[PDB]
Amino acid sequence: QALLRILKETEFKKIKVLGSGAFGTVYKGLWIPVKIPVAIKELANKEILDEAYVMASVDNPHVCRLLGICLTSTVQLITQLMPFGCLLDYVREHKDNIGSQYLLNWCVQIAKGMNYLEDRRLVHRDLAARNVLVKTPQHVKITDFGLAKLLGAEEKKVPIKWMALESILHRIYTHQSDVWSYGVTVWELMTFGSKPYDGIPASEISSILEKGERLPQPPICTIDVYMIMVKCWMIDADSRPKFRELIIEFSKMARDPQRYLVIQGDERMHLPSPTDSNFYRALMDVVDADEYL
Ligand SMILES: CC(C)(O)CC(=O)NCCn1ccc2ncnc(Nc3ccc(Oc4cccc(C(F)(F)F)c4)c(Cl)c3)c21
Q: Is 180 helix (H, G, I), strand (E, B) or coil?
A: helix
Sheet containing strand 36-42, edge to edge, reads 5-6, 66-71, 75-80, 36-42, 24-31, 12-21
Strand 24-31 and strand 36-42: the pairing is: antiparallel
Q: Which amino acid is at 175?
A: H
Question: Is 124's C-beta closer than 6 angstroms to any atom of ligand 1?
Answer: no
- Shared-domain flag, residues 209 and 164: yes
Q: Which atom of ligand 1 is nearest to the CA of 130?
A: 4
Give yes or no: 266 in active site: no
Does the residue 165 lie in any domain? yes
85 is in an annotated binding site: no
Buried b (16+ CB within 10 A) or exposed e, 204-233: ebeeebeeeebbebbebbeeebbebbebbb
Contact 37, 28 (CB under 8 A): yes
Check which CATH number belongs to the domain holding 115 and give it: 1.10.510.10
Q: How far is CA 107 from CA 183, 246, 249, 252, 258, in A?
A: 10, 8, 10, 11, 15
- Can you say whether the dihedral through the CA atoms of 99, 100, 105, 111 is positive or negative? positive
Does the residue 284 lie in any domain? no
CA torsion 104-177-59-140 (nearest 10°) is 30
136 is in an annotated binding site: no
Q: Which amino acid is at 34?
A: V
Question: Is 85's C-beta closer than 6 angstroms to any atom of ligand 1?
Answer: yes
Strand 139-142 and strand 132-136: the pairing is: antiparallel
Interatomic CA distance for residues 88 and 131, integer angstroms:
8
Q: Is 44 helix (H, G, I), strand (E, B) or coil?
A: coil
Question: Is 133's C-beta closer than 6 angstroms to any atom of ligand 1?
Answer: yes
Ligand 1 probe mutation, 64, 71, 140, most atoms within 8 A of CB: 64
CA torsion 212-216-222-227 (nearest 10°) is -30
Closest listed residue to residue 60, CA positions, set 20, 114, 19: 114
Q: How far is CA 284 from CA 15, 38, 83, 88, 134, in A?
A: 11, 11, 8, 20, 15
- Read off φ and ψ for residue 75, nearest 5 degrees: -95, 125
Interatomic CA distance for residues 229 and 209, integer angstroms:
14
DSSP annotation of 4 reads S
- Shared-domain flag, residues 147 and 210: yes
Alpha carbon of 143 to ligand 1 centroid (Å)? 6
Interatomic CA distance for residues 206 and 161, integer angstroms:
9
**Total structural domains in the chain?**
2
Radius of gyration of the CA atoms of the chain, in A: 19
Interatomic CA distance for residues 91 and 206, integer angstroms:
28
- Shared-domain flag, residues 129 and 259: yes
Check which CATH number belongs to the domain holding 67 and give it: 3.30.200.20
H-state helical runs in 100-202? 100-119, 147-151, 165-170, 175-190
Interatomic CA distance for residues 132 and 62, integer angstroms:
9
Going by alpha carbons, the residue nearest to atom 5 of ligand 1 is 19
Contact 52, 37 (CB under 8 A): no
Contact 174, 193 (CB under 8 A): no
- Read off φ and ψ for residue 134, nearest 5 degrees: -105, 105
Interatomic CA distance for residues 268 and 290, integer angstroms:
32
Domain boundaries, position 131: 82-277
Ligand 1 probe mutation, 16, 25, 41, most atoms within 8 A of CB: 41
Measured distance between the N- and C-terminal CA atoms of the chain, rounded to whole angstroms: 11
- Shared-domain flag, residues 60 and 150: no
Q: How far is CA 235 from CA 165, 201, 212, 238, in A?
A: 7, 21, 9, 9
Does the residue 23 lie in any domain? yes
- Shared-domain flag, residues 51 and 3: yes
Q: CA-based angle 218:219:220, to the nearest 5?
A: 90
- Read off φ and ψ for residue 36, nearest 5 degrees: -115, 125
- Shared-domain flag, residues 3 and 142: no
Closest listed residue to residue 288, CA positions, set 26, 66, 34: 34
* Beta bridge pairs of residue 80: 38
